């Protein structure tokens with residue numbers, strides 16, 4: 001009966017009273033595995049800070065009959081479900097958290113939090129009277145992620161936010177069980193990682209004079225300098241902070257496009273280096289792919305990135321190389337292509353990509369990039385198609401194009417993360433990508449044969465920050481759609497349930513409030529038409545039926561037990577809404593229940609749901625829903641009447 005996001009894989013509920021943590025509760029580890037013992041450490045720290053309860057770490061053994069304890073077990077039975085899987089068994093006897101790997105224990109604790117009162121997150125107030133119940137009944141949860149790659153990307157190149165903000169984001173990701181922080185740290189307007197060998201990357205590339213505002217080509221600027229970067233010490237700190245919360249950081253060093261800041265720092269890197277770090281978001285500089293100094297410089301940068309980022313994957317971008325504006329007609333390019341037998345500029349980038357792929361593999365890492373690296377024309381910049389094949393080991397993040405191109409790459413052996421930008425770009429508005437569209441996202445590309453599904457490792461949702469300058473606006477854009485993507489990445493496809501997710505989002509938004517996340521507040525539509533796809537329809541209204549105020553719909557077959565039934569009068573189309581006065585339930589020819597409140601069902605839906613109390617059914621009787629409504633200012637109105645049971 002709890003509201004964890006993401007919805008877990010398997011839950012079984014039992015009757016009775018729930019487990020409750022009290023001042024007498026203990027945290028007991030029935031294993032001496034150091035990784036499990038560590039998770040007990042921060043679980044204790046985290047739980048006690050939130051609840052105010054002592055929760056002492058006590059030796060494997062005697063718990064008190066006075067209070068349920070938390071018992072941590074290492075159980076290999078969930079090994080086949082992967083290193084993030086866990087189990088929870090909760091009753092007044094005890095709260096058992098089990099996992100094959102220590103990482104599952106951390107996720108078990110995040111689930112535990114979401115089954116307790118949201119006041120847990122409150123930084124103030126007296127909590128000594130809170131009842132720290134674990135949900136409302138005993139239960140057993142077995143949980144594991146559907147996808148191994150559940151990523152959130154934060155663009156700090158366009159606007160820098162810094163350590164405090166990124167850790168607040170990491171906190172949200174952890175609570176939602178998202179496990180990849182994709183860190184977009186370089187681009188045309190900013191370079192945010194200090195490189196010791198090349199100090200100008202930050203001394204120059206991390207500064208710009210002003211920022212375009214509003215939108216692309218707005219003609220508006222803020223006239224305010226913007227600067228900032230991370231030191232290697234700060235990165236090491238954030239890496240550890242995120243890793244303790246089950247998150248691997250994937251750094252992105254943009255190349256060969258999106259490279260203005262790097263070029264202004266060291267102008268030999270580009271054949272068309274700008275005069276200063278761009279102040280608008282429409283300048284896209286490309287590295288020089290024909291020069292040896294380019295690859296040597298980039299390899300040096302990746303050495304220092306390798307040293308401070310432990311993750312196996314290094315993202316090198318590759319998107320949106322403006323071939324026609326950067327390389328076409330340049331003598332270095334044209335001679336290099338003739339010298340190498342290349343017929344198109346996509347051959348140039350493919351040569352760059354495959355050389356960067358080997359440089360990355362020699363450092364013990366694996367490259368990832370946006371799907372332009374696959375070598376097909378994605379943006380229509382005169383690039384053509386690449387004749388040589390992309391390195392099979394390269395990971396592709398698919399953001400743009402017909403998904404048959406993604407499936408081609410998969411069938412060529414590539415692992416693929418689905419980031420189709422018409423669903424996953426959180427910088428877009430809520431009209432462009434509604435909450436419902438984020439939740440409806442399916443990372444497995446349609447029409448991909450089952451034998452290839454294991455190549456789809458997961459998804460990533462992107463917070464690009466051209467138009468985001470404060471943490472509060474970052475939250476407005478990222479949340480709550482990031483909550484939907486967390487569920488897409490974790491919950492089994494067959495357990496997804498958008499109306500249930502919307503209800504759960506209400507409690508989760510209390511946590512976001514107490515945690516300081518300024519999420520968008522009027523974006524959850526209380527009623528979406530798709531919510532009723534599997535709900536009995538008992539009638540319609542048309543212009544013809546709007547000649548009368550009273551309307552009767554048979555529900556005799558649907559009244560099978562006592563209890564509440566919700567009637568929804570849901571506008572479909574037409575110039576006019578209906579105005580609803582009351583809805584009633586009749587047994588035979590006599591009223592047995594009425595909900596009289598004013599409703600209006602049109603483009604806007606105001607109180608269109610009516611609750612009827614059915615008696616235990618009388619055998620042999622009929623039941624009829626009678627609804628009083630009329631056209632609002634006219635009779636051009638079409639709608640559907642739905643009848644829901646408990």
Ligand SMILES: C[As](C)(=O)[O-]
Pocket residue numbers: 464466
């Ligand atoms: C053009 As973009 C994906 O860097 O906002």
